[PDB]
Amino acid sequence: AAAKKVWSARRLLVLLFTPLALLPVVFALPPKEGRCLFVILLMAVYWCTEALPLSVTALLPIVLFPFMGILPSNKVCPQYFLDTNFLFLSGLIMASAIEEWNLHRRIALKILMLVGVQPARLILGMMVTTSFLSMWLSNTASTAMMLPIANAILKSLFGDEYRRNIWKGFLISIPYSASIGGTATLTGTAPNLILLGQLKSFFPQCDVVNFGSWFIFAFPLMLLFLLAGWLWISFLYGGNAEDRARAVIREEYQNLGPIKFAEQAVFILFCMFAILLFTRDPKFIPGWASLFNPGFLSDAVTGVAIVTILFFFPSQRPSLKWWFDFKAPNTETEPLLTWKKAQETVPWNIILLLGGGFAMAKGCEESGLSVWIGGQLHPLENVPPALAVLLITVVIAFFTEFASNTATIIIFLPVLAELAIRLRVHPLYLMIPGTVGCSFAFMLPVSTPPNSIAFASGHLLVKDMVRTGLLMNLMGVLLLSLAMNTWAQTIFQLGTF
Amino acid sequence: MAALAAAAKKVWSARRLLVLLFTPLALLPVVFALPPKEGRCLFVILLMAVYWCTEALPLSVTALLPIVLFPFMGILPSNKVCPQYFLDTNFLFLSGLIMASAIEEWNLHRRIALKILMLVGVQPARLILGMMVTTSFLSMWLSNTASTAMMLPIANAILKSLFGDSRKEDEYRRNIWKGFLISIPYSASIGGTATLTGTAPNLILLGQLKSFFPQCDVVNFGSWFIFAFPLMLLFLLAGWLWISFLYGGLNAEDRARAVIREEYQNLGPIKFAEQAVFILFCMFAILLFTRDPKFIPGWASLFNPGFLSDAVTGVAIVTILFFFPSQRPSLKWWFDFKAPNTETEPLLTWKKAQETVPWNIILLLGGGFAMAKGCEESGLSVWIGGQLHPLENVPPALAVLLITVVIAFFTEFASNTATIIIFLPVLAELAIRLRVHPLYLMIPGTVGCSFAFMLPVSTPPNSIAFASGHLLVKDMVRTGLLMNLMGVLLLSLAMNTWAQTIFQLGTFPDWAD
Ligand SMILES: CC(C)CCC[C@@H](C)[C@H]1CC[C@H]2[C@@H]3CC=C4C[C@@H](O)CC[C@]4(C)[C@H]3CC[C@]12C
Ligand SMILES: CC(C)CCC[C@@H](C)[C@H]1CC[C@H]2[C@@H]3CC=C4C[C@@H](O)CC[C@]4(C)[C@H]3CC[C@]12C
Ligand SMILES: CC(C)CCC[C@@H](C)[C@H]1CC[C@H]2[C@@H]3CC=C4C[C@@H](O)CC[C@]4(C)[C@H]3CC[C@]12C
Ligand SMILES: CC(C)CCC[C@@H](C)[C@H]1CC[C@H]2[C@@H]3CC=C4C[C@@H](O)CC[C@]4(C)[C@H]3CC[C@]12C
Ligand SMILES: CC(C)CCC[C@@H](C)[C@H]1CC[C@H]2[C@@H]3CC=C4C[C@@H](O)CC[C@]4(C)[C@H]3CC[C@]12C
Ligand SMILES: CC(C)CCC[C@@H](C)[C@H]1CC[C@H]2[C@@H]3CC=C4C[C@@H](O)CC[C@]4(C)[C@H]3CC[C@]12C
Ligand SMILES: CC(C)CCC[C@@H](C)[C@H]1CC[C@H]2[C@@H]3CC=C4C[C@@H](O)CC[C@]4(C)[C@H]3CC[C@]12C
Ligand SMILES: CC(C)CCC[C@@H](C)[C@H]1CC[C@H]2[C@@H]3CC=C4C[C@@H](O)CC[C@]4(C)[C@H]3CC[C@]12C
Ligand SMILES: CC(C)CCC[C@@H](C)[C@H]1CC[C@H]2[C@@H]3CC=C4C[C@@H](O)CC[C@]4(C)[C@H]3CC[C@]12C
Ligand SMILES: CC(C)CCC[C@@H](C)[C@H]1CC[C@H]2[C@@H]3CC=C4C[C@@H](O)CC[C@]4(C)[C@H]3CC[C@]12C
Ligand SMILES: CCCCCCCCCCCCCC
Ligand SMILES: CCCCCCCCCCCCCC
Ligand SMILES: CCCCCCCCCCCCCC
Ligand SMILES: CCCCCCCCCCCCCC
Ligand SMILES: CCCCCCCCCCCCCC
Ligand SMILES: CCCCCCCCCCCCCC
Ligand code: NA
Ligand code: NA
């Protein structure tokens, strides 16, 4: 009867009734911690229920932290656009440049020629490709450069419920594969570098974690969880015609024609971006960041430097004969990317969302909420450490679904640092579970910017994404526990304290 | 001689690449001339200045230069320069842009403009005055470019309706056309200085104050408004008199009033969304004003000192735009089971906001703040103060006149925001070296960098007006020369008479030393 009427106004009802429901939190724990927890819970609920746009919810700290006395405006506001956000913006601009010159179509047609007209094989090929791209570029960047290519593929082979299901599956597998792939390498995603920095700050003695050890530990995790995710996606979606379809694919590739100068320039700039990102500071061989002051340079500097070239590099081959040829027309050349097209195609909502995550992370750190959570985790000492770490990675994997991976790893890593020494257990045996599990962001489009990029297409629903992310999180947690039980104990020698 | 012309044309064709690849080569000697950190910071600042003035790179891309240059050159680490791009001043700017987008999306701006045009009159001088008043009062909150772009069609329609012999009549017609087409961008530029969110340079002043003098907080929305609004009104009246004398000659009226009515009636009745947006904008302005007027204790005194700012108020106000319904809610909807259950539309959707907010200006403000921070940390400001030794005996008032004239005539070629970004550290150092309040030199520069009246390339509103075709460059120059002179004189009067009381510039402050 009235259920439809109530559901019609669900957004306003959530907006007005969430602070009322979260009010007892403020009185439950100490004042500043209570206010910070209230803000975190309000932001998480508004993100899950989509009561407000993800950017508008991301701007909540600017209003709530100063009013509640947690952080001043001049402290919460600068956190919104940190160097990690600049790296993400540079990756988004690079993806926009790649898509703007129809290089994504070329890559898509090459992938179809390599694989063939089979939805499951194409899905697996994109899982592999996006995971490979995620080990060297950040998850958001790989997702932004791979959704255009996936959409090109889908428009290629398909030119009714089966088609729509393939749409859903092959548009949702890309952000999920990127999130899975970010974990294997330290350079793969920001939370790994955050973990390394927090380990260096907290534990100068502990230095067993490097690029090689982390890679050999986490690449099997990539393979296992990627196979599990691919099987889950295939089961959920999709369970002389072939010659004609392949002939159409060759015809489309020929219709693409020879590769233009702008396409090659953009591809070379992308390759330089990836190479300079990887070689900036490897943990086994010093990078070119050692040629400068220590700690001055980061991935943001490289991203902005590479992106700046796109805005002045010519999109046509420059000929020295033009200067001598007085008969040639004197027309201005088109750069690789104009700022108008970039501003049109850059998702500033994702930038604001990441900034809100950073701001809420700093608010949690400054208000003393993290210390309070660490203190409340005290009675988890008579409980055996194995399933204790299991439940810790469970709660981390189910908390990263609201905020960004960076925000949740920053929030939870010092808590685990205090907890591990308090409980007489190996610090890494808690460091690495949380760092890996923060990337297990699969429920909501707000969980990670890859999910937002995928959801921006409009072919994905919240219900289907949550249904997939349930089992994705469960298998990720189980594989994390298995890794910590079998081969993490010997690679990182964390089985003996 | 034709070969030289062809070579010059070819050089001008590739001027952007030539400037971009030759500016570092030309600016290399400053690194060797100066101490290392100061020299590198000066090289970066001059490179950004040249790139902004010549438009070799997009303004946003040039604003991202510090993120590359400061970490490489050791001036400032990445984790210290990157957060400078969203200081709370930039979030106040973003909130103002969101409010302006909400106002424009519901045609409230057109309704206000047409109402003011109806009220002011139809007489030539009265029509010019009403057009200028509308453009200036509407540029306080909208961008000057948007106000000019909306007001040009209305002025064109009114002029066509009004004039629907020999040299006298058509000369008068063309002069009247020129007067209306020149009165809009000048009024927009004048009005932009009235409010902090009116134009970017005011927020640049705020952000660079946050860096050079973190202890300085006397400049806020209320103080800036109470300082600039009388000055804006005086300069607007002076410009109106000047334009009317130059051009306005200081049934047709019935037809013009009829076309204004028809343009107003086409807006339809005032809808609930327009009223809601107007009320939200009024609360926005009032709460920005009354947060800390500095002469009545504002509502910020009810919370922790130093925690609240104009950014918090702006974000809180513009948050309501994204969930407040656009249609009037009805209590009977719950009772009426037969009514459709269609989802309601908010006042502003994030799609429209994202597609109607100029993120380029946000990045430009962030780049300016980052450059100010780098100049402060690198010690280049101390070097500039040391080198400003000869300019120590100059009277402070004469110094204000000279800096205002220089900045007002410099902005005629480059962007106002870039001009103020480049000039603000120099003004700060000169004010420090003169044993006078830093604001006494910062505020004249911030106000005068918007005194861009002489060229179509000075401001985008000037280009919009020039695109009509009824105006020549000579008219621009003749009007803007005396416009600049009058603006400089009025700015000096304001800075010497009543800005002293508003900003307490009489005594050198403790935080300035
Ligand atoms: C539905 C969404 C918005 C909120 C869901 C969580 C709510 C219902 C939870 C979170 C924390 C909870 C509080 C935590 C602790 C206490 C103290 C004790 O007296 C029991 C009730 C009380 C006061 C709880 C009430 C319910 C509570 C406020
Ligand atoms: C609602 C979902 C997302 C889980 C979020 C956990 C929050 C809402 C709940 C779970 C556990 C709860 C806490 C459990 C124990 C205590 C200690 C007691 O002395 C006061 C209440 C307090 C401090 C509770 C506050 C609310 C709390 C932190
Ligand atoms: C059929 C077998 C024997 C030979 C296949 C050769 C061609 C089709 C293969 C060999 C190497 C392949 C490339 C290897 C890596 C990448 C990078 C990835 O981000 C997009 C696809 C792309 C660009 C592949 C496209 C297809 C490719 C060029
Ligand atoms: C162009 C691509 C390959 C990246 C840039 C080149 C990289 C690989 C080069 C350029 C400068 C090089 C560094 C220069 C000097 C040293 C000091 C030496 O004691 C250890 C290696 C180390 C730290 C080098 C590592 C490799 C390095 C970083
Ligand atoms: C300064 C020295 C190195 C020589 C000049 C180098 C640079 C500035 C020159 C070399 C080749 C030139 C290009 C050659 C041809 C064209 C195509 C024409 O339709 C627009 C200009 C454009 C795109 C020129 C721009 C300037 C250019 C890139
Ligand atoms: C919700 C996010 C932000 C934080 C992570 C969850 C936190 C709040 C949860 C996870 C584990 C929880 C604790 C689990 C067990 C106990 C013992 C009980 O006798 C009192 C509550 C207490 C001490 C809980 C307090 C809240 C707690 C620390
Ligand atoms: C880029 C254009 C528009 C502005 C002018 C840039 C060049 C020509 C200017 C900027 C600053 C100047 C330098 C400033 C100071 C000195 C020290 C002394 O030895 C005199 C020459 C020398 C070394 C100047 C040489 C020319 C110079 C490098
Ligand atoms: C909310 C607005 C738009 C309409 C309501 C009237 C305005 C003028 C009201 C609402 C709240 C009011 C403020 C509430 C509290 C204080 C603190 C007191 O020590 C001085 C007056 C001052 C600073 C009030 C000034 C007037 C004020 C700003
Ligand atoms: C304050 C608490 C107690 C009650 C809140 C009631 C709110 C959520 C109700 C009251 C009136 C309602 C509106 C009444 C009529 C319509 C038109 C119809 O197309 C549905 C949306 C819309 C626009 C409703 C949205 C929800 C609404 C605003
Ligand atoms: C539009 C024009 C004609 C009117 C304004 C003219 C300007 C230049 C005049 C008007 C008021 C004047 C100021 C009034 C009083 C003083 C105090 C005196 O101890 C030094 C000069 C100083 C600071 C004057 C400087 C010049 C001044 C600013
Ligand atoms: C005085 C009470 C302090 C604790 C509760 C604060 C509640 C703030 C709610 C803000 C909601 C913003 C989105 C509608
Ligand atoms: C203990 C001193 C502060 C008391 C109030 C804290 C909560 C303030 C909430 C303000 C919310 C404003 C929403 C627009
Ligand atoms: C046939 C291809 C020849 C080489 C083309 C190179 C284009 C530009 C690549 C990116 C260069 C970035 C540094 C200037
Ligand atoms: C070793 C010399 C240091 C000083 C000169 C550095 C020059 C950097 C030029 C950067 C240009 C960026 C825009 C093309
Ligand atoms: C004294 C230690 C640093 C030496 C080099 C300083 C200048 C570096 C310039 C790098 C420019 C990079 C442009 C992309
Ligand atoms: C007779 C007056 C009718 C007014 C209709 C529009 C009301 C808009 C109210 C907006 C309130 C925003 C803050 C809650
Ligand atoms: Na996350
Ligand atoms: Na304006």
Please give the Cα distance from A456 to A279 (Å, whole number). 32
Rg of chain A, C-alpha, whole Å = 24
A281 CA to chain B: closest CA distance, Å?
14
Mutate one of A52, A332, A343, A358 to test the B interface: name it (highest B CB count within 10 A): A343
Rg (CA), chain B: 24
Q: Which residues of chain A neighbour B91 with C-beta distances below 8 Å?
A: 59, 62, 77, 80
Both tokens of A145, joined, read: 């450069």
- Length of chain A in terms of residues written: 497
Tell me which residues of chain A, numbers 78 to 117, contact chain B at a CB-CB cutoff of 8 Å: 78-83, 85-86
Question: Are B87 and A78 within 8 A, CB to CB?
Answer: yes
Whether A311 and B82 lie within 8 Å, measured CB to CB: no
Quick check: CB of B325 below 6 Å from ligand 14? no
Whether residue A83 and residue B78 make contact (CB cut-off 8 A), yes or no, is yes
* Residue among A428, A426, A427, A442 nearest A477 (CA): A442
The answer to whether A308 contacts B20, with C-beta atoms less than 8 Å apart, is no
Tell me how far apart the alpha carbons of residues A193 and A189 are, in angstroms, rounded to a whole number.
7
Alpha carbon distance B395, B136 (integer Å)? 34
Q: What residue's CA is closest to ligand 9, atom 21?
A: B344
CB pair distance less than 8 Å for A333 and B303: no
Contact B13 A304 (CB under 8 A): no
Q: Is the CB of B320 under 6 A from ligand 16?
A: yes
Question: Which residues in chain A are contacts of B56 at CB distance < 8 A?
Answer: 312
> How many whole angstroms separate alpha carbon B67 and alpha carbon B62?
10
Angle in degrees, 0-180, between the axes of helices A369-376 and A348-367, rounded to the nearest 10: 60
Would you list the domain boundaries of chain A?
Answer: 1-52, 83-226+240-345
Cα–Cα distance measured from residue B398 to residue B388, given in angstroms and rounded to the nearest whole number:
16
Residue B247 in contact with residue B159, Cβ under 8 Å?
A: no
The reply to whether residue B67 touches residue A301, judged by beta carbons under 8 angstroms, is yes
Helix (H, G, I), strand (E, B) or coil at B137: helix
Resolution limit in angstroms?
2.6
Burial tier of A463 (Cβ tally within 10 Å: 0-12, 13-18, 19+): exposed
- DSSP class of residue A457? T
Indicate which of B16, B76, B88, B377 best probes the interface with A, i.e. most A CBs within 10 Å of its own CB: B88
> Looking at beta carbons, which residues of chain A come within 8 Å of B48?
none
Q: Is B437 helix (H, G, I), strand (E, B) or coil?
A: coil
Give the separation between CA A484 and CA A428, rounded to whole angstroms: 10
DSSP state of A347: -
Torsion of CA A260, A261, A265, A267, to 10 degrees: 20
The DSSP letter of residue B87 is -
Which of these, B428, B490, B458, lies nearest to B228 by C-alpha position? B490
What is the distance in angstroms between the Cα of B186 and the nearest Cα belonging to chain A?
27
Q: Return d(Cα A165, Cα A283) in angstroms, integer.
A: 43
Do the Cβ atoms of B448 and B416 come closer than 8 Å? Answer: no
Q: Is B283 in the pocket of ligand 8 (CB under 6 A)?
A: yes
B357 CB neighbours in chain A (<8 A) are 348
Please give the Cα distance from B420 to B283 (Å, whole number).
30
How many residue contacts between A and B have a Cβ separation below 8 Å? 176
Phi, psi of B346, rounded to the nearest 5 degrees: -70, 170
What would the DSSP string read from start to end of A121-174?
A: HHHHHHHHHHHHHHTTS-HHHHHHHHHHHHHHHHHHHT--HHHHHHHHHHHHHH
Show Cβ contacts of residue B133 under 8 Å, excluding neighbours closer than 6 positions: B116, B120, B187, B236
Report the C-alpha gap between B63 and B204 in whole angstroms.
Answer: 13
For every residue of B397-420, DSSP letters joined together read: HHHHHHHHHHHHHHTTTS-HHHHH
Cα separation, B172 vs B136, in Å, equals: 26
Chain B residues within an 8 Å CB radius of A297:
71-72, 77-78
Long-range contacts of A36-41 (CB under 8 A, 24+ apart): A36/A65, A36/A68, A36/A70, A36/A363, A36/A364, A36/A367, A36/A368, A36/A369, A37/A369, A38/A68, A39/A64, A39/A65, A39/A68, A39/A70, A39/A360, A39/A363, A40/A360, A40/A363, A40/A364, A40/A369
List the structure tokens of A248: 């159409």
Ligand 14 in reach of B24 Cβ (< 6 A): yes
Which of A63, A292, A310, A338 would you mutate first to test chain B, the one with the most B CBs within 10 A?
A63
Contacting residues of A for B78, CB less than 8 Å apart: 83, 296-298, 300-301
What is the number of other CB atoms lying within 10 angstroms of the CB of residue A237? Answer: 23
The C-alpha atoms of residue B63 and residue B362 are separated, in whole angstroms, by 10
A73 contacts in chain B (CB < 8 Å): 88, 307-309, 311-312
Q: Does A86 sit within 8 Å of B83, measured CB to CB? A: no
For atom 26 of ligand 1, the residue with the nearest CA is A24
C-alpha to C-alpha distance for A74 and B263, rounded to whole angstroms: 45
- What is the residue type of A110? K
CA–CA min distance A466, chain B (Å): 23
Cα diameter, chain A: 87
CA distance A82 to chain B (A): 5
Contact by Cβ (8 Å): B504, B221: no
| Amino acid, res. B203 | L
* Cβ separation B309–A74 shorter than 8 A: yes
Question: Cα(A435) to centroid of ligand 2, in Å?
Answer: 23
Does A73 contact B307 at a Cβ distance shorter than 8 Å? yes
Cβ A43 vs Cβ A353: under 8 Å: no
Instruction: Please give the number of the atom of ligand 3 that sits closest to the Cα of A133.
Output: 19
Find out whether A442 and A454 touch, Cβ atoms under 8 Å.
Answer: no
Distance A20 CA to ligand 11 centre (A): 9
Experimental method: cryo-EM
Which of B71, B306, B341 comes nearest A4 by C-beta? B341
Rounded CA-CA distance B270/A6 in Å is 30
| Cα A337 → chain centroid | 25
